[PDB]
Design a protein around this nucleic acid. Structure first.
Ligand SMILES: [K+]
Ligand SMILES: [Mg+2]
Ligand SMILES: [Mg+2]
Ligand SMILES: [Mg+2]
Ligand SMILES: [Mg+2]
Ligand SMILES: [Mg+2]
Ligand SMILES: [Mg+2]
Ligand SMILES: [Mg+2]
Ligand SMILES: [Mg+2]
Ligand SMILES: [Mg+2]
Ligand SMILES: [Mg+2]
Lengths: 151, 138, 337
RNA sequence: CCCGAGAAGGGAGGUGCAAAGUGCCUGAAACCUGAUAGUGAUGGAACGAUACGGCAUGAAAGGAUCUCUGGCAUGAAGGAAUCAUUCGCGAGGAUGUAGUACGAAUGUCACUGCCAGUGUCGUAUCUUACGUUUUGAAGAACGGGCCAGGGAGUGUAUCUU
RNA sequence: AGCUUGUAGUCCGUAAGGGAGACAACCCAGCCCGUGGUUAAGGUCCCCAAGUGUCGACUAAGUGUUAAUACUAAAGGGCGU
RNA sequence: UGUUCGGGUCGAAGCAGGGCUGUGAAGUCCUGUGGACCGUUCACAAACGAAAAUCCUGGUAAUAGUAGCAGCAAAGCAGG
RNA sequence: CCCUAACUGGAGUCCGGUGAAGCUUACAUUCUAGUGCACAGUCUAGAGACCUCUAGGGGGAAGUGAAGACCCCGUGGAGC
RNA sequence: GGAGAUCGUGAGCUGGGUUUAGACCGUCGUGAGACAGGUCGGUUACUAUCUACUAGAGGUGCCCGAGGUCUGCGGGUAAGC
């Protein structure tokens, strides 16, 4: 419904921020993607996300492993969160643009903070057997991204 | 370095367990096959094959076969080995069949009160006989 | 309750029924020497099956003297290289490797498996092993061998398979002398096995992946009205109320095949050199044609085609000298017909 | 003004004492995301109490003859060691040394810069939740997923004290 | 019959703490808080604080290593000792 | 509520965490947040204290990125 | 049925999207025996146990669903 | 051969019997109805959280770094009868 504060506030001088505002994506898959890309350079994070969206690269699923098989290569359970990857890539593009506007250089910046926040839920319903209607909700996700040029 | 030749198994085990719990030394026990168990041979063999063949395969007791492992297990039952003190004590104990090559020529000791010549009869077996009748190669 | 009895479904002698840890069979026991020094094992590659017409020479058999059709397994047996000599020391805790000398010159394709040992210490390594034997530190000697599948065409691999083989000799000094004779040479299957003798075959069996208890353990299906109540290929019960657990002896789904198995008393019916003698019209299906020297083993052998089959002299053979088989006809008709 | 397909949203920048930014005052908990401290892939379970330690913290609101470490004096109950003699078959006992040295604590003099507290983990001892129904509850008896809020001896008349 | 129904005492119920492996009611003990000391029941080979204690015998069966105990097998026999 | 004596935009109530006191019910103070009200003496009242009622209302977990999105009409592909 | 085999389509399995519900005081890697309201993952003494994940059929959780409809009791009902 | 495993085993099956509502026969009862007789008919719920097991993986521990070959503490076997 409104704007949101960030969990972490980097210093304005050498840091850029962006917020994906209540996207209709999976909070669990986006949480896994944010766990994967935090700490990476912005360019390498973009390349990794493009590979994931292209199915050339799986993200490890260490917290929400149910429903995921093991992936080839040195990995346990992992998936290809296409929708979450696309939304997080849009947020990363916005943060890189904000860094450029600040006068900073996104080519030399790092994703120091990438977190999700569950937003307000849009409540739907799933009609069931025997006269029962159960929920089917639209979960929204806020994506917090902070780029910094120092570590 | 304790020489287990001609020593009562339980009395040697009690002595060594108390020494390990006095927490200042590493104990080596050699010639574990030569330790003595008092009582008739039939009774000791019966009780050791009952203990050897007891447990469940997925769960149960895995009673060892080697005489050195049997002696370590006997000491294990006189320690709080599930506790940090007992785990430390078990980590400082080494039991051997015969003499290991490294300990060869080292000066050994014997517990006088665990000596088998204090027994009043000839009803005893050596630990090695029990181990080899349980099918242990050593 | 008055109970009907049934033997237990399957054998618990091969539990856990897991995947073999290697694609090569490992021998846990070696028989006793009964003659001159020689390798106790050989390794070939399974080609396929055919059948022969031979005169039944088996003593006391009902069909002795007349023509019988005998299924055989053809196994390609190119010469193996003796790669190393390994000496073992026996103590209370069992055998330990104490020394190894590698042959000076080894095949270049061996690099596909391991970095090649250099042409360094062979005289001094051998004299070290001789000293260890003289001082009583050595209990026995084994030969490290590897296959050279590059000469084969139905087997696509060029990387050798390395395994330890026993040496059969009356004394440890004789074993060391023989091993030094054979070190770095190429040994033919005729230098290990003779025609008409029994051998033990070991291989990793055919892999079937994950299989249900009906196929894996041979449990009964649900019968009659139970066949269509929803549990047809499932075990009837997982356990009793007490003990409150599923025993490991209850038949369950899991890996089937691709296990190590040893067969006993498989008779060698022919040692051949010309692969045209056994290759059928149109070739062996999915394999091709035999090129080098081969061996005919009576009956079946574990493993599919192209698996490495390890042959060792028999460990529990009963019959004495069997003789040379009189193979009247080797079937070369199309296996594809 | 920049990014964005954008009449979304975000960033930057403003307004205002304060974002209080439109279902917008304050803005708890459950729940969820992240960070920090401790711990952690050889490990045993009413999740704590008690004692002692490791690590972290210890700004305010707590101590400054307070904390640490010692000396000296007085010290209740209790009370040795060692040695001598004697008794006992022996393990040992008795008598003397000795109601001494010591001893909770109470004072006093120096030394010291921590201590109290808090979080987490470890070692030691103890404890099988809570409410209820029960002779008997850790029960394989009943009740509660969790948190917030609501949730049960009141009035009239009359008698008695 | 760990059954049922009486009676006297004492307990649990409503009884901590200490000890019996654990133990509603068995033993010590009834218990304000803190510290020091000495004991009780019970224990002293190790687990586990304190005896590999003393004297005199018995047992060869791992018998036994089980106060009360709902938690511990008889009649009968033994040129076993 | 009556009554006595107060505090508050130089920051009330509330909230999160902490210090001290009290056997305790609790009280008080500190830091932050908050933006307008709050206490206290002696008395008096009550719609006065919750962990429990398969309690009620709201909010929200685990289950779980799981079941389902198949069975009765298996329908889509190329190019633009 | 002896005695099952092969094959076909739909599920399942694996991937993308979408996306619930039901058991839940807590803890929880167990196994044996005893004990205990005499049917214990948690008590006692032992025996085991490195953690995480996937698939799988349902041994156990006296699994979940429902204040037992059988029996008795209630100076409770209803119909006949 | 016999017996134990909640007279093992319905979150495995079955449903013939017993143990609902319907009806018939005999008997009993004035009757409604009943019978420890007989007879015909009569719905078998759940997507597995934990634990256990069967198999398959990813780690961490051990460890010059890596690879290969072995050993065998142990586990299992009825591998034969
Ligand atoms: K049976
Ligand atoms: Mg969604
Ligand atoms: Mg409807
Ligand atoms: Mg309330
Ligand atoms: Mg009494
Ligand atoms: Mg009562
Ligand atoms: Mg009383
Ligand atoms: Mg008590
Ligand atoms: Mg409440
Ligand atoms: Mg009445
Ligand atoms: Mg069942």
């Amino acid at each position: 419904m409104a704007r949101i504060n960030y969990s972490i506030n980097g210093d304005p001088e050498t840091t850029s921020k962006a917020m994906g505002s209540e996207l209709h994506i999976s909070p669990k898959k986006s949480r896994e993607v944010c766990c994967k890309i935090k700490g990476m350079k912005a360019s390498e994070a973009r390349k990794f996300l493009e590979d994931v969206i292209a199915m050339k690269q799986a993200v490890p699923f260490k917290k929400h492993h149910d429903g995921s098989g093991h992936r080839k290569g040195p990995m346990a359970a992992g998936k290809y969160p296409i929708s979450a990857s696309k939304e997080i890539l849009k947020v990363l593009k916005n943060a890189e643009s904000n860094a450029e506007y600040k006068g900073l250089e996104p080519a030399n910046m790092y994703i120091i903070h990438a977190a999700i926040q569950r937003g307000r839920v849009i409540h739907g319903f799933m009609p069931r057997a025997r006269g029962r209607a159960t929920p089917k909700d639209t979960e929204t996700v806020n994506i917090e991204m902070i780029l910094s040029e120092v570590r | 370095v304790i020489d287990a030749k001609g020593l009562i198994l339980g009395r040697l085990a009690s002595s060594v367990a108390k020494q390990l719990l006095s927490g200042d030394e590493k104990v080596y026990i050699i010639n574990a096959e030569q330790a003595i168990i008092s009582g008739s041979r039939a009774a000791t063999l019966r009780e050791y094959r009952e203990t050897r063949e007891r447990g469940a395969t997925e769960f149960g007791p895995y009673f060892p076969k080697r005489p050195d492992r049997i002696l370590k297990r006997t000491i294990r039952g006189m320690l709080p080995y599930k506790r940090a003190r007992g785990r430390d004590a078990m980590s400082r104990l080494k039991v051997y069949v015969g003499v290991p090559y490294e300990l060869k020529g080292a000066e050994t000791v014997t517990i006088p009160d665990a000596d088998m010549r204090l027994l009043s009869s000839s009803r005893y077996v050596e630990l090695g006989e029990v181990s080899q009748k349980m099918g242990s190669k050593f | 309750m008055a109970s009907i009895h049934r033997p237990k479904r399957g054998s618990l002698a091969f539990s856990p029924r897991k995947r073999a840890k290697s694609h090569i069979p490992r021998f846990r026991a070696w028989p006793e020497a009964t003659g001159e020094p020689k390798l106790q094992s050989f390794a070939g590659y399974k080609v396929g099956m055919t059948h022969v017409i031979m005169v039944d020479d088996t003593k006391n058999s009902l069909t002795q003297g007349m023509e019988i059709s005998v299924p055989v397994t053809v196994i390609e047996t190119p010469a193996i290289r003796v790669a190393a000599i390994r000496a073992y020391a026996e103590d209370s805790t069992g055998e330990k490797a104490i020394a190894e000398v590698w042959a000076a010159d080894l095949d270049p394709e061996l690099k596909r498996r391991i970095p090649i040992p250099a042409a360094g210490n062979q005289a001094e390594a051998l004299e070290n092993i001789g000293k260890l034997i003289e001082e009583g530190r050595v209990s026995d000697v084994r030969a490290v061998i590897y296959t050279l599948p590059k000469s084969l065409t139905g087997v696509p691999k060029k990387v050798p398979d390395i395994m330890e083989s026993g040496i059969s000799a009356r004394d440890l000094g004789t074993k060391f002398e023989y091993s030094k004779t054979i070190l770095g040479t190429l040994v033919s299957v005729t230098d290990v096995f003779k025609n008409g003798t029994l051998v033990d075959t070991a291989a990793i069996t055919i892999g079937k992946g994950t299989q249900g208890p009906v196929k894996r353990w041979g449990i009964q299906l649900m019968k009659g009205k139970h066949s269509r109540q929803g549990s047809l290929r499932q075990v009837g019960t997982l356990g009793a109320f007490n003990p409150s657990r599923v025993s490991w002896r209850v038949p369950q789904m899991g890996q089937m095949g691709y296990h190590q198995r040893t067969e006993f008393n498989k008779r060698i019916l022919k040692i051949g050199s010309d692969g045209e003698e056994v290759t059928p019209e149109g070739g062996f299906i999915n394999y091709g044609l035999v090129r080098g020297d081969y061996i005919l083993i009576k009956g079946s052998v574990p493993g599919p085609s192209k698996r490495l089959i390890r042959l060792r002299d028999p460990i529990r053979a009963k019959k004495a000298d069997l003789g040379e088989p009189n193979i009247l006809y080797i079937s070369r008709e199309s296996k594809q017909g």
